[PDB]
Write a protein that binds this ligand. Sequence first.
Ligand code: HEM
Ligand code: HEM
Ligand code: HEM
Lengths: 373, 184, 55, 76, 66, 54, 238, 35, 48, 22, 98, 139
Amino acid sequence: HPLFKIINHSFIDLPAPSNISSWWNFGSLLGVCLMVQIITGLFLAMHYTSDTMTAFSSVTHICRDVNYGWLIRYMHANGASMFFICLFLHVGRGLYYGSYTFMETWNIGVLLLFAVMATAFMGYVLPWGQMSFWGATVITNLLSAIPYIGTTLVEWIWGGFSVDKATLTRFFAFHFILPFIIAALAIVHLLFLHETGSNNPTGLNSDADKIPFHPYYTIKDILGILIMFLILMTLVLFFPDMLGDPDNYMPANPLNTPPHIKPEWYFLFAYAILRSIPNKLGGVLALILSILILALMPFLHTSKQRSLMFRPITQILYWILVANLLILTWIGGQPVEHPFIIIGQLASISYFSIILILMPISGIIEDKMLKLY
Amino acid sequence: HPLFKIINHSFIDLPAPSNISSWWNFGSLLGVCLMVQIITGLFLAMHYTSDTMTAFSSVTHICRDVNYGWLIRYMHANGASMFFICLFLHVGRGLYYGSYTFMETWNIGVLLLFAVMATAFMGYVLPWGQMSFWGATVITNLLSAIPYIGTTLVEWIWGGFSVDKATLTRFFAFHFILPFIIAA
Amino acid sequence: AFKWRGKPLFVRHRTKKEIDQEAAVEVSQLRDPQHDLDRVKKPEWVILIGVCTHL
Amino acid sequence: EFGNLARIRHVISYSLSPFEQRAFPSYFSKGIPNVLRRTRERILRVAPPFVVVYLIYTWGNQEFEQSKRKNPAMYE
Amino acid sequence: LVDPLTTVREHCEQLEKCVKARERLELCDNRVSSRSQTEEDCTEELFDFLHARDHCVAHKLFKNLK
Amino acid sequence: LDLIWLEKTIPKSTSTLHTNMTTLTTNQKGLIKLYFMSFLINIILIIILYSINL
Amino acid sequence: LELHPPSYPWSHRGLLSSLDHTSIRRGFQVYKQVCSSCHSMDYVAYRHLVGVCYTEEEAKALAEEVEVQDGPNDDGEMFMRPGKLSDYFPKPYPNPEAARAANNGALPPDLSYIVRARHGGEDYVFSLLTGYCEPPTGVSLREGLYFNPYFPGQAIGMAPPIYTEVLEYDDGTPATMSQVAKDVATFLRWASEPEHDHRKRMGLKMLLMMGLLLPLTYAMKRHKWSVLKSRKLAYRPP
Amino acid sequence: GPRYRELARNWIPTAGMWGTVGAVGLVWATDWRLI
Amino acid sequence: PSRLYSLLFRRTSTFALTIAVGALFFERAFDQGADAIYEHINEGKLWK
Amino acid sequence: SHTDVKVPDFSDYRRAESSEAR
Amino acid sequence: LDGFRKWYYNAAGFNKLGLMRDDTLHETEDVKEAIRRLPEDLYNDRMFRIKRALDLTMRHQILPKDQWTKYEEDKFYLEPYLKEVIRERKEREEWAKK
Amino acid sequence: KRFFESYHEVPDGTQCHRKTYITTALGGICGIIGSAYSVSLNPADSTLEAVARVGRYTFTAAAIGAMFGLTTCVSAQVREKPDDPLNYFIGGCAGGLTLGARTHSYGTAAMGCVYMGTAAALFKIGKLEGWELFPTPKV
Ligand code: HEM
Ligand code: HEM
Ligand code: HEM
């Protein structure tokens, strides 16, 4: 059977490495999260209205009058947060174990990451709260950076002089349509990978030890799905407002602006970098590079060993990178004042210097220690 | 490239019969029509509001105030009509030339036909005119025919006692989401 | 402000002192060289649009 | 696919049926020792960095407050 | 009728930690009295005092409350 | 708990703590240079003890 | 720079702890008699109460106790009728500006989601309503202002609305300022999340189901993964 | 090296032509009047 | 018990029947038991 | 040959008529 | 430097899985050409060592300390064969520039 | 010297950074002195070998200084109780553990923890009760 041929090839009789840890669960979790988001998003779309007079009213009507509508809405919000948690851990697995040498898979990945960030940004604009409106304006005016092409482009997205209904409705249309493009790009992501097979934490050729996927990494993915569902629900049913922001529960006032404005947690590392660079344009570029530096990552691998299991100096540099990524996430939250700014400036300098300079030099030193260089 | 192989396996080096007439064009036309519909539908979705107070007003705003919005709306409507013309001629080609012996292809086809008819029905409900509302009630009522669970099913779909805003909004969501399932 | 064109239309009146200091401000030393009066038809009356040049 | 993945020779591989073996053989018996073995093998390469993070965090917060604190000499 | 808060407040209030805090505020209050011709205020002193007081009261207002 | 744990902790440990401490303090070369230099160190520290507590 | 309201031991503060519904009923009475003159609980309708702290017919009573206009009439605009269970709470100052004027420039913020919209709302609310202390030295609030250490800027247009014994609780529980601030904070909380109770029940069922299902799925995984985890490899070059 | 140099010198003229097409294309499409 | 394996686990069909039937009743029991708990935990606060 | 060694012991794994239950 | 290299060899940790240094090389084109040129016995030992290391990583175990790979003992078998691959590779490259 | 003293001036549990820095220095100073006596007597074989020992002793001592400082400050931070011998004991407890590790011995960590922590705790009590050490003759 043609279909079963395909089915057996990507999920049942696929030869997988026997020694991949729980981190390799995370990408499958991302796919599940995508479906969960789509399903919850569809059940938000049967009652949401993309009109600036009625968007907040429709969201409150979902939370108060639709049967279990609060459940689907907070599942959607905390599932976006769970999506970004699993995305960050997936990218960290790819950075740590040398999986970026699968270059086409890595580039389709960073395209997926850009698409997911754009989808989450427009989705956060969608409830039309105080925080959504000022966040949109701010993040969009960012586009106003480009000197000749930027200004017009901004109002083009804004569809007018300033974000207003024109934006909300087109942001609803985009935010609806992009997760299906994300699903298609994820299918391309899976294809570009099966051509090469998954990597293992030792970083070695695992062709001598491969097992089926149906009984070994399926029940493992089912267990990971169950644990991820435990964390999501316990972040919806018990701590539903933990990851959100209180000022989004006020209606969008163009005349007032929330005093303390901040992007959601996931977009902060970038926020910090942007704020750090004095020049507006510089910030925008660095911000982009922040995400793009990853794509650049497969050309910076100067070691003869694929994984970091046997590479302790680059392990130390990797955990310092995770450390100042957490620092940049914290700084974004902090307001503009001493000494948060300096940390932000250093943390950004250290982030770019560790990824660009320190890891290939350390890999050269590690190759010299094993009498290879 | 691994992806390139798919292209050269389905569109370039695919061995096709040399003597197929113009009728064999029609299915490719359907695919083009699908994209066209999706593209026009996306540019209707940036200004349409699925609220019963504002749906007709949003459609008139598309036709009167959006730059070339009348063009995209009437392209969407007449592209749905062109989709059904090409669909009927595709099915007639399949019936005439004995192409139904490809049984799996034929069954996936009739599933696609059911999905396209449901998509066009809910899309015609979407502008919330006089004809859309009475048309919706009529076919939704069709379901009530079900011997035992009919009433419930109708009310479920309507989302209430009678088609009203509850329907319009869920019909907008379903009409948005089904052409991607049609593409798959 | 009257939210003109979807953006806060700041309209302000200034005091003798207010008007006096703004003139005292060094136009050249200003980040943006635009003397107070350069942006106002009336010293007692200043009108501005409320969008931070930044974001 | 399987059969054409790799070439090995003379590597015998014994195994047991799932139902024939205990589900959690010595789970806490050796699990604890191993988990502890494992941590001591990477703890020195994971925690140190984050320790300094806690530190910068704290110093940062305190410093800010001090900045907000009114200068005694100020106004006096 | 006596608002339970008053009671709880009195208690936490009597505490020296708080008493001296208030006193520090007093010195501040007085500073502004003599240093009347300035812009220095006692808002910051006010808050820190209260934070302490309330924290404690809050620790113990709900019990009395019904 | 009797015998080993209550004898290794209080009675025996104190036995070992000292035994080891005497071994380091009493393992001396016997050479005068070494010993003397230790006098040097002492003078230095005492000079400081006075200095810092001036 | 703002005072950060302390943590209070709420009866719903716990992980599975629901709301005290008598306190929600008392806080609704507090809102109806005091807070409804300036603030608008736009997103809470009389019907909402049914099932929480007022029974169907009982709610009908409250509903019947308000005049709500019906705009479309054969030839008229408004013969406000007995508000029904489907009517939403009556917003004072039909137009925002109206209040602006009444409150001296301030716009009471609709308290439907105030607790959710204010950082540490429940606490803030309690603190603000009970934080009306003496202004300090050097402070110069503008006309029509009051002093609350918590409110942003410490200059809230709202005058202190809860004077001890401001209103009498029908239940008779002494109407001390605090007892009233705690009740209205519970109610506003309920308002901002009418499903608080239902959810926590779902969370309890979720914890019980995950405590049942996680070791069993772990046992199935360790069954199907024991085979390999016992595999013994041996190299036997000829 | 020398060979690749020959290659570049041999293709750069072609490349310039391609860029030229793009110039016309981009400008015409952008309707940038400056051009 | 070897009656189980022979009556419930042995034939997939039987393995299923027991699951479905059990699940049908489990809900009754779980809901009942769970509700008892939830309520008691907050016995005082609930409409009645 | 193939008889030089015997299957390694799985006693710490092996469990201790029973199949039906197992 | 010799003692610090032994300390780094212990800190790298592939000896605890019984691996050699040349087992840990990333299989690029030159490395696969050098592996293909190995004799049959060395290739079979390399594949068994890699399979045993993968099994140990699966069970999250390491070898007993007496079975680890002593730094002094590790043999750089692939190295000789690899140099050639690189040498040949470079030669072809320079000739290309010719 | 105005420096070291600073450790005491700020309330415990607060400004851990300063605390850890000061504690680390004292340990390190002791490290130098200790290494010095260790090198003067029981000399080394080569200058480098001895420089190493100085380093070893210095770092180990600096470490036992840091963790003591860090643990005690944080323990107080987290526990919110500034004045409590227990804070210090946890700190001394930790300090001993670092020594134990540097010496690669669980047993030492045992005696180290108990003995070292107890000592530190007594320091806290000493400060709390105003115990006087090396007192002037007041007869
Ligand atoms: C839409 C979100 C994403 C999903 C659902 C996803 C899912 C997956 C899945 C299921 C795998 C197979 C590995 C496994 O499950 O064991 C995988 C592999 C991989 N992904 Fe992702 N991924 C996503 C985003 C990304 C991003 C952003 C990157 C790049 C930073 C990336 C890079 C990779 C790489 C390099 C691999 C191969 C690693 C390996 O399997 O050994 N992915 N992804
Ligand atoms: C086709 C798939 C998707 C659909 C149809 C969809 C639909 C919607 C709709 C209608 C809303 C507004 C309702 C509300 O905010 O409560 C919304 C909000 C949101 N969506 Fe999606 N969505 C989809 C996928 C995603 C994905 C992939 C993400 C993550 C990148 C995401 C993140 C969000 C976020 C963050 C919000 C705002 C949550 C909040 O109000 O706090 N959605 N979505
Ligand atoms: C995902 C892709 C699609 C989107 C986003 C979309 C969106 C819309 C929207 C917003 C409308 C309301 C505006 C209007 O009246 O035209 C609409 C109407 C309509 N759509 Fe679609 N549509 C899509 C695909 C399709 C397809 C594939 C068909 C044909 C089967 C179709 C047939 C219609 C029809 C017949 C109408 C009513 C036209 C009329 O007003 O007379 N749509 N669509």
